[PDB]
Design an enzyme around this catalytic site. Structure first.
Site, PDB file in Angstrom:
ATOM      1  N   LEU A  17      21.986  32.775 -64.745  1.00 13.54           N
ATOM      2  CA  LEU A  17      23.206  33.122 -64.027  1.00 13.54           C
ATOM      3  C   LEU A  17      23.179  34.507 -63.409  1.00 13.54           C
ATOM      4  O   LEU A  17      23.854  34.732 -62.403  1.00 13.54           O
ATOM      5  CB  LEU A  17      24.427  33.017 -64.952  1.00 13.54           C
ATOM      6  CG  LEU A  17      24.777  31.601 -65.394  1.00 13.54           C
ATOM      7  CD1 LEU A  17      25.973  31.625 -66.328  1.00 13.54           C
ATOM      8  CD2 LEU A  17      25.029  30.725 -64.164  1.00 13.54           C
ATOM      9  N   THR A  19      22.178  39.041 -64.230  1.00 14.18           N
ATOM     10  CA  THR A  19      21.752  40.129 -65.094  1.00 14.18           C
ATOM     11  C   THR A  19      22.805  41.225 -65.077  1.00 14.18           C
ATOM     12  O   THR A  19      23.385  41.525 -64.030  1.00 14.18           O
ATOM     13  CB  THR A  19      20.393  40.679 -64.631  1.00 14.18           C
ATOM     14  OG1 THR A  19      19.421  39.628 -64.678  1.00 14.18           O
ATOM     15  CG2 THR A  19      19.932  41.819 -65.521  1.00 14.18           C
ATOM     16  N   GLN A  21      24.445  44.828 -67.748  1.00 18.47           N
ATOM     17  CA  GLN A  21      24.068  46.019 -68.502  1.00 18.47           C
ATOM     18  C   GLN A  21      23.312  45.690 -69.782  1.00 18.47           C
ATOM     19  O   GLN A  21      22.661  46.576 -70.350  1.00 18.47           O
ATOM     20  CB  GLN A  21      25.311  46.853 -68.824  1.00 18.47           C
ATOM     21  N   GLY A  23      21.242  42.782 -69.945  1.00 19.42           N
ATOM     22  CA  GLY A  23      20.139  41.897 -69.625  1.00 19.42           C
ATOM     23  C   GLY A  23      20.556  40.584 -68.989  1.00 19.42           C
ATOM     24  O   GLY A  23      21.545  40.529 -68.252  1.00 19.42           O
ATOM     25  N   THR A  83      30.156  32.907 -74.204  1.00 18.86           N
ATOM     26  CA  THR A  83      31.455  32.990 -73.546  1.00 18.86           C
ATOM     27  C   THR A  83      31.752  31.737 -72.733  1.00 18.86           C
ATOM     28  O   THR A  83      30.891  30.879 -72.501  1.00 18.86           O
ATOM     29  CB  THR A  83      31.579  34.223 -72.631  1.00 18.86           C
ATOM     30  OG1 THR A  83      30.704  34.081 -71.503  1.00 18.86           O
ATOM     31  CG2 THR A  83      31.251  35.507 -73.373  1.00 18.86           C
ATOM     32  N   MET A  86      32.064  30.163 -66.080  1.00 20.53           N
ATOM     33  CA  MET A  86      32.908  30.268 -64.893  1.00 20.53           C
ATOM     34  C   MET A  86      32.061  29.857 -63.696  1.00 20.53           C
ATOM     35  O   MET A  86      31.238  30.637 -63.215  1.00 20.53           O
ATOM     36  CB  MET A  86      33.432  31.696 -64.761  1.00 20.53           C
ATOM     37  CG  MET A  86      34.209  32.178 -65.983  1.00 20.53           C
ATOM     38  SD  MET A  86      35.832  31.377 -66.110  1.00 20.53           S
ATOM     39  CE  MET A  86      36.688  32.180 -64.765  1.00 20.53           C
ATOM     40  N   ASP A 130      36.862  49.115 -67.897  1.00 24.26           N
ATOM     41  CA  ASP A 130      36.090  49.030 -66.653  1.00 24.26           C
ATOM     42  C   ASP A 130      36.609  47.889 -65.778  1.00 24.26           C
ATOM     43  O   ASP A 130      35.849  47.054 -65.279  1.00 24.26           O
ATOM     44  CB  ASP A 130      34.592  48.893 -66.925  1.00 24.26           C
ATOM     45  CG  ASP A 130      33.753  49.067 -65.662  1.00 24.26           C
ATOM     46  OD1 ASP A 130      34.226  49.728 -64.715  1.00 24.26           O
ATOM     47  OD2 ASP A 130      32.622  48.535 -65.610  1.00 24.26           O
TER      48      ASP A 130
HETATM   49  O1  LIG Z   1      26.756  41.031 -69.142  1.00 14.88           O
HETATM   50  C1  LIG Z   1      27.430  41.669 -68.334  1.00 14.88           C
HETATM   51  N1  LIG Z   1      27.496  41.333 -67.044  1.00 14.88           N
HETATM   52  C2  LIG Z   1      26.616  40.320 -66.473  1.00 14.88           C
HETATM   53  C3  LIG Z   1      27.248  38.953 -66.391  1.00 14.88           C
HETATM   54  C4  LIG Z   1      28.467  38.686 -66.998  1.00 14.88           C
HETATM   55  C5  LIG Z   1      29.034  37.426 -66.937  1.00 14.88           C
HETATM   56  C6  LIG Z   1      28.393  36.398 -66.255  1.00 14.88           C
HETATM   57  C7  LIG Z   1      28.980  35.043 -66.194  1.00 14.88           C
HETATM   58  N2  LIG Z   1      29.704  34.655 -67.263  1.00 14.88           N
HETATM   59  C8  LIG Z   1      30.246  33.428 -67.256  1.00 14.88           C
HETATM   60  N3  LIG Z   1      30.143  32.493 -66.316  1.00 14.88           N
HETATM   61  C9  LIG Z   1      29.414  32.885 -65.259  1.00 14.88           C
HETATM   62  N4  LIG Z   1      29.136  32.155 -64.140  1.00 14.88           N
HETATM   63  C10 LIG Z   1      28.357  32.924 -63.305  1.00 14.88           C
HETATM   64  C11 LIG Z   1      28.119  34.141 -63.867  1.00 14.88           C
HETATM   65  C12 LIG Z   1      28.783  34.143 -65.135  1.00 14.88           C
HETATM   66  C13 LIG Z   1      27.164  36.662 -65.662  1.00 14.88           C
HETATM   67  C14 LIG Z   1      26.602  37.922 -65.730  1.00 14.88           C
HETATM   68  C15 LIG Z   1      28.242  42.856 -68.769  1.00 14.88           C
HETATM   69  C16 LIG Z   1      27.906  43.561 -69.920  1.00 14.88           C
HETATM   70  C17 LIG Z   1      28.658  44.655 -70.316  1.00 14.88           C
HETATM   71  C18 LIG Z   1      29.738  45.062 -69.564  1.00 14.88           C
HETATM   72  C19 LIG Z   1      30.073  44.378 -68.417  1.00 14.88           C
HETATM   73  C20 LIG Z   1      29.329  43.282 -68.014  1.00 14.88           C
END
Ligand SMILES: O=C(NCc1ccc(-c2ncnc3[nH]ccc23)cc1)c1ccccc1
Length: 258
Positions: A17, A19, A21, A23, A83, A86, A130
């Site tokens: 999906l 990358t 903070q 990975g 999680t 989405m 944030d």
């Molecule tokens: O991990 C992080 N950001 C990268 C991220 C996050 C969510 C998703 C994602 N979650 C669910 N469904 C989805 N569908 C498409 C994308 C996608 C993808 C990448 C982050 C870490 C610490 C602080 C802030 C952000």
């Protein structure tokens, strides 16, 4: 396995999906059936023991407009964060896709989605820390949800200068009212179809602009009433900025009028 702990053997990894903070993040199925996003936490990126304890709090945060944390996989390294998935991805990318030909009614609904999530977090005394379009996601129904709330506290140049009020830039004073300021910038991002706030400025120049009391101005797609709402988030005095409950009332009123 504790209540916050998911068995990683129940996961099927299917697609990548993106990358962030911590990975890579992947799309998968939990128990062969339920869509999930899986954050794979790169070594050395996260204050892991602190995050795991806070995950117990995040699990009790439950609102339709908040990307739900289902649990964590902590027995092996890298650890996983599981999680809600989405399907339409990051709000910032979604806004920038001109094929959507958004109506302003849709843009106001996105603002309402986020504001409902933020009113819920405020009612739990939980700061996002944030809030920005990059930390909102969009589901297959076009509903915007707030993601990764509070996660910056566990991340070990990239500071969100453009979403920060003067008291954060000057004194590191974070509060409910710094989330309010950020929400105003997020409304600006939505109505600007994903433009970078203060696009002609560096972060340093943005900080000086804000310190001098100057502001973003009205996106072309924002009505006067919508602009009034986003601008109210940017009062120099934090205590004169609205709450998320008031912002939500103001947004709902504009929906009725327009
Ligand atoms: O991990 C992080 N950001 C990268 C991220 C996050 C969510 C998703 C994602 N979650 C669910 N469904 C989805 N569908 C498409 C994308 C996608 C993808 C990448 C982050 C870490 C610490 C602080 C802030 C952000």
């Amino acid at each position: 396995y504790g209540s916050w702990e998911i068995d990683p053997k129940d996961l099927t990894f299917l697609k990548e999906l993106g990358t962030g903070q911590f990975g890579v993040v992947k799309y998968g199925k939990w128990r062969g059936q339920y869509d999930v996003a899986i954050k794979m936490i790169k070594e050395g990126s996260m204050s892991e023991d602190e995050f795991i304890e806070e995950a117990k709090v995040m699990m009790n945060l439950s609102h339709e407009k908040l990307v739900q944390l289902y649990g964590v996989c902590t027995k092996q390294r890298p650890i996983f964060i599981i999680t809600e998935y989405m399907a339409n991805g990051c709000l910032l990318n979604y806004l920038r896709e001109m094929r959507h030909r958004f109506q302003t009614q849709q843009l106001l609904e996105m603002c309402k989605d986020v504001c409902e999530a933020m009113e819920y977090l405020e009612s739990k005394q939980f700061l996002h820390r944030d809030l920005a379009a990059r930390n909102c996601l969009v589901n297959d129904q076009g509903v915007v949800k707030v993601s990764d709330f509070g996660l910056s506290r566990y991340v070990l140049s990239k500071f969100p200068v453009r979403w920060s009020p003067p008291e954060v830039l000057m004194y590191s004073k974070f509060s409910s009212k710094s989330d309010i300021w950020a929400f105003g910038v997020l409304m600006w991002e939505i109505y600007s179809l994903g433009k970078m706030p203060y696009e002609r400025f560096t972060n340093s120049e943005t900080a000086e602009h804000i310190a001098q009391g100057l502001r973003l101005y009205r996106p072309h797609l924002a009505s006067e009433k919508v602009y009034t709402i986003m601008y109210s988030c940017w009062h120099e005095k934090a205590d004169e900025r609205p709450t998320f409950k008031i912002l939500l009332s103001n947004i709902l009123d504009v929906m009725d009028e327009e």
